[PDB]
Design a protein around this ligand. Structure first.
Ligand SMILES: c1n[nH]c(-c2nccs2)n1
Ligand SMILES: c1n[nH]c(-c2nccs2)n1
Length: 152
């Protein structure tokens, strides 16, 4: 039948919220109070792909926008982009591989690995107001761990 989706927010393990940074980038910053409303709401779709108890293939669309996080090579590197799609055709169960993340449960958190680029992860910097990016390094300075909130 359809694809199943949940509305949600993400925060990094330093409890930084994700906001828009112009039309095709996200940034992470410490938010609390009134400025909370600025945070991006995702539609997390549960998509076709290799799956285990702790590794769940998802797409991350922006709620009621035809925009998805995607992983592509840019100037020869795996790169996180926001990509526009035909709103008539999305979301769908068989999302193209650039749109798929393996949502992995790790020590009471989540990591989002690129299905396209193994061991590349949605990442944030420790610094405030810097882009969300696709990083190839776990256990370093950059943050690869999240919690998820289920929105109405
Ligand atoms: C509260 N928010 N997110 C969580 C998680 N527990 C396991 C994976 S993410 N608890
Ligand atoms: C297992 N995987 N994700 C979870 C969550 N609990 C709270 C938010 S997400 N449990």
């Amino acid at each position: 039948a359809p694809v199943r989706s949940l509305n949600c927010t993400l925060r990094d393990s330093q409890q930084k919220s994700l906001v828009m940074s112009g039309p095709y980038e996200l940034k992470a910053l410490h938010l609390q109070g009134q400025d909370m409303e600025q945070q991006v709401v995702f539609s997390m779709s549960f998509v076709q792909g290799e799956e285990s108890n702790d590794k769940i293939p998802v797409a991350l669309g922006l709620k009621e926008k035809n925009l998805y996080l995607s992983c592509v090579l840019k100037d020869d590197k795996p790169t996180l982009q926001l990509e526009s799609v035909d709103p008539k055709n999305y979301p769908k169960k068989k999302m193209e591989k650039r749109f798929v993340f393996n949502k992995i449960e790790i020590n009471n958190k989540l990591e989002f690995e690129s299905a396209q680029f193994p061991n590349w992860y949605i990442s944030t910097s420790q610094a405030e107001n810097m882009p969300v990016f696709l990083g190839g390094t776990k256990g370093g300075q950059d943050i690869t761990d999240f919690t998820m909130q289920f929105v109405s």
